[PDB]
Amino acid sequence: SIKTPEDIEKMRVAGRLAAEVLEMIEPYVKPGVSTGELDRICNDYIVNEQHAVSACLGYHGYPKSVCISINEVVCHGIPDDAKLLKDGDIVNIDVTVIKDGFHGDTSKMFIVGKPTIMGERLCRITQESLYLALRMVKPGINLREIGAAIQKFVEAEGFSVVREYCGHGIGRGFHEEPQVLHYDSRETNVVLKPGMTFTIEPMVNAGKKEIRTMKDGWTVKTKDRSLSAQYEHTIVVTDNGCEILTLRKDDTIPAIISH
């Protein structure tokens, strides 16, 4: 569907709130803190300050408000009061809030304590793959091209792209069409049109692409247990490019990308 100007404004508000949760939580992401408390802090902020609601809580049965994945955990890490961040960890906090019926979806990586070379690199490269994808977004381009570009860049680094998960259209629904693959697929055939709103959220493994789901029915780790990183932004396709709806102060890319 092509969001109307009214819907797009609502997406701007929802996206801003999602981004601000990530900005707000940053100071708390330090050695010693539990992912459980981080989740509590995020939920209180969303509910009490943003007067919004986490879209993840209860989604497909998801138990928490935000997803927090550490190191080898690829995605859907479940916040837990007994899981503490430690020096060297790379942590993804993925937020999705619903405000006035619309969803804002975004995640970023946080480096805890003293960063490790592989960690800094995996995170920087993963974000750059998101960035290069964003710089390609504009009417007429096919999503297949974007997924192809992300994969090419990532694999050039000797990393791999997780295939089981993808970006997605977003709006009044958390996950709407189309699917936004972060790799080249002969199944992908979607030409971008202005007004389309979707996410780009590549999951990149330092090692092999294969994954493993744990036994809590949610946590996903790399099969080989290598590090995995992810960054995500919600965007709206504009007439000559796109507008990042979930941009943060620490983002090193413009909100409005012109072509």
Ligand X SMILES: O=C(O)c1ccc(-c2cc(Cl)ccc2Cl)o1
Eight-state DSSP code of residue 49: I
233 annotated ligand binder: no
**Residue 62 binding partner per list Mn ion, Na ion, ligand X, none, with a CB distance cut-off of 5 to 8 Å that depends on partner kind:** ligand X
Question: Taking CB under 6 A as the rule, does residue 28 contact ligand X?
Answer: no
Contact between 35 and 71 under an 8 Å Cβ cutoff? The reply is no
User: What CA–CA distance (Å, rounded) separates 116 from 99?
Assistant: 37
Q: Which residues precede chain breaks (C–N over 2.5 Å) in the chain?
A: none
Only one residue has tokens 């010693």, namely 32
Does 210 carry a binding-site annotation?
no
Number of neighbours of residue 9 by Cβ within 10 angstroms: 13
- 177 touches ligand X (CB under 6 A): no
Residue 168 marked as a ligand binder:
yes
Q: Is 94 known as a binding-site position?
A: yes
Rounded to a whole number of angstroms, the minimum distance from the CB of residue 167 to ligand X is 8
Query: Between 190 and 229, how does the x/- string for binding to ligand X read (CB under 6 A)?
Result: -----------x----------------------------
197 near Mn ion (CB under 5 A): no
Which CB, 59 or 87, lies closer to ligand X? 59
Residues 125 to 154 in contact with ligand X, rule: CB under 6 A: none
Region near ligand X per CB under 6 A, out of 45-53, 55-63, 150-158, 177-185:
55-63
Q: Which of 7, 89, 94, 251 binds Mn ion (CB under 5 A)?
A: 94
Q: Please give the radius of gyration of the chain, using alpha carbons only, rounded to the nearest integer.
A: 17
Nearest Cα residue to 139 out of 226, 241, 221, 231: 241
**Distance in angstroms (rounded) separating the CA atoms of residues 30 and 68:** 14
Give CA–CA dist 166/201, Å, rounded: 7
3-state secondary structure at position 204: strand
Residue 159 CB, nearest approach to Na ion (Å): 12
User: Considering the rule CB under 5 A, would residue 69 count as an interface residue with Mn ion?
Assistant: no
State the nearest-atom distance from the C-beta of 56 to ligand X, in Å: 4
CA distances from 1 to 7, 97, 195 (A): 11, 20, 8
* Residue 72 in contact with ligand X, rule: CB under 6 A: no
State yes or no: 232 annotated in a binding site.
yes
* 201 labelled ligand-binding: yes
d(CA 24, CA 155) in angstroms, rounded, equals 33
Rule CB under 6 A: which residues touch ligand X?
56, 59-60, 62, 67, 76, 94, 105, 201, 232
Annotated binding site for a divalent metal cation: 94, 105, 168, 201, 232
